[PDB]
RNA sequence: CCCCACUAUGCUUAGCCCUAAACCUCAACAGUUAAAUCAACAAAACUGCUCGCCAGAACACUACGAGCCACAGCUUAAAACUCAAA
């Protein structure tokens, strides 16, 4: 690494600094004073104090990226968001008066809820002890399941069975399916929760 | 081991050499100073060795020689100090003084002195536990309503933490021929190098190589990077920027321009806002470059 | 018997390690040839090799420490440090011989700057 | 015998483990050791004697709270010698090695897995 | 060694047998706390007086003799050969 150990990661949170000194606790006052002495790394290209910034969508875009072509990944992400928005508007214009109150048109809300609906809380850990592999249930950390939902969504959208259907169109369809607890990603979560319930007797190996 | 006669002679040779160097440089020996010694020795005997102590030096023998010899008793044998037989007369005398001040008070950014330099001040070796006890007494004295003599006494035993990293250099404010105030700054990211001029008053117009920023930077990511500095301190649309960038690519040029604008914008914001920008990473050069 | 029963002074240049060549130590030979754009670095190095061998062979067991091979213009200063063991007449004879030999060797004005010392100036011990 | 002075100064293994497990459970069933231990309702998972009969490790099931676990550990460690004395006094075993109370780590994994499987969605009738 | 069952025996009566780490491993009486207290450990160190007992280890809680309600028993209890230790 080209940064010395003294260098610390920057804090881009804009409203953190505007906090009144009166609200600051003694510990928070101390750490604010301490950061004065520390050296701070240059903020990386990426996160910004923008009010429209979304770390989850940024991570999804980075996970779609191939060969460092970030422009194309962000283009695909924004196209997916626009497609979801337009599909929801089309479904809203054609809905009954009482059905328009339960139709979400915010693409960010749909994206977050669809990813949350696919998060597995339990997983397996291959462990060979007696000469034969043994899959044991283990509770998944929050970061692990957040990553797994994204990875499953992207892998499902990268299947070759979808011939000539462009990535934004496939991803919008999968997101809207997972928003309603439907589709193959929700089934992949269910088949993991079931295959980890089928081996609850193997937890004693942990 | 250096005998006192040896040090006396070396003082003599240093004095005669000082007058000799003053003669050589043509300066008046009477007012010739130690800084003059250092400068003249650097000139006569140039040395770019990085270790400053490996370069030529002609210092007063007192500073060079670590010879110490203190007599604790006279010819009659009576020790000078009343705490001599403790073996730590300096330390226990200091503790006695501190305890007496604590009794008197009872009747009524910086760091603590580290163990080794406390030993140097006392000229006596001491352990960890007695150092801790002394520091505890000093802290207790601080807790009480210390008066004048007390807090300069404590200040004797507190060094300065000269590591305040809030030392961003605020660019001076210059004035153009039209009388408008502005500030210029530089920045570098990978092979891209940028120089930005930020005006105190403006309407949010950024000119990159004489081209509007939305035309010079088609990609929204670069425009967000150019936003980050002004947005962080709530002055979007309040300044004009004229920047020149060369080398590197799209992202490197955007980052260099961001750094340049942040460093130039430091002039028109408060010190607290400068520190907030520093803690956000807006004023640090990115050192990550391609590796061989 | 049976198997189971069985079962230095250093000078300144010598004392400091090579990674102090620009921190604590210096360069014995000083020439422009190695600089950027300057030529004949290898020629200068070959001259240095021969010159050091010929000094150490013309002053055997006399040089207290390594030479200093300086060059300004076409000049060639060998600032050597030797001991006080040989007689001064031998030192003068060797100085004259080596100066003339090297001046006709390189077709350049070579010169010697012998500095006698009472003994090896030890820096530390390894 | 001047107690003042003293105080101041394998199939067999499995059978013994089973006997000791039963005896320790029976001891913990009552305040015979102490009321503080009885109120804790400590449960044992197993008893393991070391192969050389130098120690007896009693594995006690841990609870979810950490403060209660620490209190249970303190009480058990303070009570171990008294339980050893009671075991030999009742003539369950002629000689009992020192008793070491060890926390059973495995059961917590199953407990967490159960608390998760309780709330999991598995799909439609499958 | 663990489980089940069951004897001699543990119990009473009338006789025997007479052995134990039968030990506080401290012989009974009287006295002292002053001396360097005092090899060590055990259990603070001693004095007066009396009886019993001991004089390298092993042979040996043995052999022989004698006595005994005891008969593969108990008490008393050696020597030869051997060793430089115990
Ligand atoms: K006894
Ligand atoms: Mg008895
Ligand atoms: Mg008697
Ligand atoms: Mg008797
Ligand atoms: Mg005998
Ligand atoms: Mg007999």
UniProtKB/Swiss-Prot annotation, chain A:
Gene3D superfamilies assigned: Ribosomal protein S7 domain (1.10.455.10)
InterPro entries (UniProt xref): Ribosomal_uS7 (IPR000235), Ribosomal_uS7_dom (IPR023798), Ribosomal_uS7_dom_sf (IPR036823)
Highest taxon of the lineage: Eukaryota
Localization: Mitochondrion
An example Gene Ontology molecular-function term: RNA binding
Predominant place of localization: mitochondrion
Cellular component aspect of the GO annotation: mitochondrial inner membrane; mitochondrial small ribosomal subunit; mitochondrion; ribosome
GO terms classed as biological process: mitochondrial translation; ribosomal small subunit assembly; translation
Keywords assigned by UniProt, alphabetized: Acetylation, Disease variant, Mitochondrion, Primary mitochondrial disease, Ribonucleoprotein, Ribosomal protein, Transit peptide
Entry keyword annotation includes Mitochondrion: yes
Modified residues (N6-acetyllysine): 174, 194
CDD domains cross-referenced by the UniProt entry: uS7_Mitochondria_Mammalian
Disorder association: Combined oxidative phosphorylation deficiency 34: An autosomal recessive disorder caused by mitochondrial dysfunction and combined respiratory chain deficiencies of complexes I, III and IV. Clinical manifestations are variable and include congenital sensorineural deafness, lactic acidemia, and progressive hepatic and renal failure.
Family: Belongs to the universal ribosomal protein uS7 family.
Protein name: Small ribosomal subunit protein uS7m
Organism: Homo sapiens (Human)
Name of encoding gene: MRPS7
Swiss-Prot record, chain B:
Listed name of the protein: Small ribosomal subunit protein uS9m
Tree of life domain: Eukaryota
Sorted UniProt keywords: Acetylation, Mitochondrion, Ribonucleoprotein, Ribosomal protein, Transit peptide
Binding partners and assembly: Component of the mitochondrial small ribosomal subunit (mt-SSU). Mature mammalian 55S mitochondrial ribosomes consist of a small (28S) and a large (39S) subunit. The 28S small subunit contains a 12S ribosomal RNA (12S mt-rRNA) and 30 different proteins. The 39S large subunit contains a 16S rRNA (16S mt-rRNA), a copy of mitochondrial valine transfer RNA (mt-tRNA(Val)), which plays an integral structural role, and 52 different proteins.
Cellular component, GO, one term: mitochondrion
Subcellular localization, as worded in the UniProt entry: Mitochondrion
Mitochondrion is among the record's keywords: yes
Example GO biological process: mitochondrial translation
Modified residues (N6-acetyllysine): 200
Any one Gene Ontology molecular-function term assigned to this protein's record: RNA binding
Family: Belongs to the universal ribosomal protein uS9 family.
Transmembrane residue ranges: none
Curated annotation (Swiss-Prot), chain C:
A molecular-function term among this protein's GO annotations: RNA binding
GO biological process: mitochondrial translation
GO CC annotation, single: mitochondrion
Main location: mitochondrion
Domain of life: Eukaryota
This protein's record includes keyword Ribosomal protein: yes
Cellular localisation: Mitochondrion
The entry's keywords: Mitochondrion, Ribonucleoprotein, Ribosomal protein, Transit peptide
A UniProt-annotated Pfam family: MRP-S24
Similarity remark: Belongs to the universal ribosomal protein uS3 family.
Subunit structure: Component of the mitochondrial small ribosomal subunit (mt-SSU). Mature mammalian 55S mitochondrial ribosomes consist of a small (28S) and a large (39S) subunit. The 28S small subunit contains a 12S ribosomal RNA (12S mt-rRNA) and 30 different proteins. The 39S large subunit contains a 16S rRNA (16S mt-rRNA), a copy of mitochondrial valine transfer RNA (mt-tRNA(Val)), which plays an integral structural role, and 52 different proteins.
PANTHER family assigned: MITOCHONDRIAL 28S RIBOSOMAL PROTEIN S24, SMALL RIBOSOMAL SUBUNIT PROTEIN US3M
Protein's UniProt name: Small ribosomal subunit protein uS3m
From Swiss-Prot, chain D:
The protein, known as: Putative ribosome-binding factor A, mitochondrial
Statement: the UniProt record of this protein carries the keyword Cell cycle: no
Keyword Glycoprotein: no
Family, as annotated: Belongs to the RbfA family.
Subcellular location field: Mitochondrion
Gene encoding the protein: RBFA
A GO cellular component entry from the record: mitochondrion
Sorted UniProt keywords: Mitochondrion, rRNA processing, Transit peptide
GO biological process, any: rRNA processing
């Amino acid at each position: 690494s080209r940064y010395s150990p003294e260098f610390k990661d920057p804090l881009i949170d804009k409203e953190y600094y505007r906090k009144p000194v009166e609200e600051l606790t003694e510990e928070e006052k101390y750490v604010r004073e301490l950061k004065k002495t520390q050296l701070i790394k240059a903020a990386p290209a990426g996160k910004t104090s923008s009010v429209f910034e979304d770390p989850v969508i940024s991570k999804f875009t980075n996970m779609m990226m191939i060969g460092g072509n970030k422009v194309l990944a962000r283009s695909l992400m924004i196209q997916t968001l626009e497609a979801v928005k337009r599909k929801q508007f089309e479904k809203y214009h054609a809905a009954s008066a009482e059905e328009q109150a339960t139709i979400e048109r915010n693409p960010y809300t749909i994206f977050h809820q669809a990813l949350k609906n696919c998060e597995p809380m339990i997983g397996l850990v291959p462990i060979l002890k007696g000469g034969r592999f043994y899959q044991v249930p283990v509770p998944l950390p929050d970061r692990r399941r957040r990553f797994l939902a994204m990875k499953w969504m992207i892998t499902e959208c990268r299947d070759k069975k979808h011939q000539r259907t462009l990535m934004p169109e496939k991803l919008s369809h999968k997101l809207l399916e997972a928003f309603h607890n439907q589709g193959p990603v929700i089934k992949r979560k269910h088949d993991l929760h079931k295959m980890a319930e089928a081996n609850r007797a193997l937890a004693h190996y942990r | 081991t250096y005998t006192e006669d040896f040090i006396k002679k070396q003082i003599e040779e240093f004095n005669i050499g000082k007058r000799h160097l003053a003669n050589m440089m043509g300066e008046d020996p009477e007012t010739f100073t130690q800084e003059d010694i250092d400068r003249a020795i650097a000139y006569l005997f140039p040395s770019g060795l990085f270790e400053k102590r490996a370069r030529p030096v002609m210092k007063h023998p007192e500073q060079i020689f670590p010879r110490q010899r203190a007599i604790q008793w006279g010819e009659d044998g009576r020790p000078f100090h009343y705490l001599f037989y403790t073996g730590k007369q300096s330390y226990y005398s200091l503790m006695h003084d501190v305890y007496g001040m604590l009794l008197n008070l009872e009747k009524h950014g910086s760091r603590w002195l580290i163990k080794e330099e406390l030993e140097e001040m006392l000229v006596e070796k001491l352990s960890d536990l007695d150092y801790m006890q002394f520091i505890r007494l000093l802290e207790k004295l601080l807790t009480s309503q210390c008066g004048a003599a007390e807090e300069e006494f404590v200040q004797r035993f507190r060094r300065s933490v000269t590591l305040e990293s809030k030392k961003q250099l605020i660019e001076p404010v210059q004035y153009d021929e039209q009388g408008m105030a502005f500030s210029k700054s530089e920045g570098k990211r990978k092979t891209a190098k940028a120089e930005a001029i930020v005006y105190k008053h403006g309407s949010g117009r950024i000119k990159v190589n004489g081209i509007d920023y939305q035309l010079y930077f088609p990609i929204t990511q670069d425009r967000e990077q150019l936003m980050f500095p002004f947005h962080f301190v709530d002055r979007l649309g309040k300044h004009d920027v004229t920047c020149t960038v060369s080398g590197g690519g799209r992202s490197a040029q955007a980052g260099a321009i961001r750094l340049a604008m942040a460093k130039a914008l430091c002039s028109f914001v408060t010190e607290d806002e400068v520190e907030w920008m520093r803690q956000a990473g807006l004023l640090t050069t990115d050192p990550r470059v391609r590796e061989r | 018997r049976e198997l189971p029963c069985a079962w230095k002074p250093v000078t300144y240049e010598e004392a400091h390690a090579p990674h102090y060549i620009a921190h604590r130590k210096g360069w014995l030979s000083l020439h422009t040839g190695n600089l950027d754009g300057e030529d004949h670095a290898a020629e200068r190095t070959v001259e240095d090799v021969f010159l050091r061998k010929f000094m150490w062979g013309t002053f055997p067991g006399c040089l207290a420490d390594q030479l200093v091979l300086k060059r300004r213009g076409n000049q060639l200063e060998i600032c050597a440090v030797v001991l006080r063991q040989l007689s001064p007449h031998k030192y003068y004879f060797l100085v004259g011989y080596s100066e003339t030999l090297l001046s006709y060797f390189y077709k350049c004005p070579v010169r010697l700057h012998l500095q006698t010392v009472p003994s090896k100036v030890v820096y530390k011990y390894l | 015998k001047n107690w003042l002075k003293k105080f101041a100064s394998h199939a067999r293994l499995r059978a013994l483990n089973g006997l000791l497990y039963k005896a320790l459970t029976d001891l913990l069933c009552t305040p015979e050791v102490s009321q503080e231990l009885y109120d804790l309702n400590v449960e044992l998972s197993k008893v393991s004697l070391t192969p050389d009969f130098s120690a007896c490790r009693a594995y006690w099931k841990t609870t979810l709270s950490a403060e209660q676990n620490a209190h249970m550990e303190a009480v058990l460690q303070r009570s171990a010698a008294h339980m050893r004395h009671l075991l030999m006094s009742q003539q369950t075993l002629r000689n009992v090695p020192p008793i070491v109370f060890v926390q059973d780590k495995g059961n917590a994994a199953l407990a967490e897995l159960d608390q998760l499987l309780a709330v999991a969605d598995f799909g439609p009738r499958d």
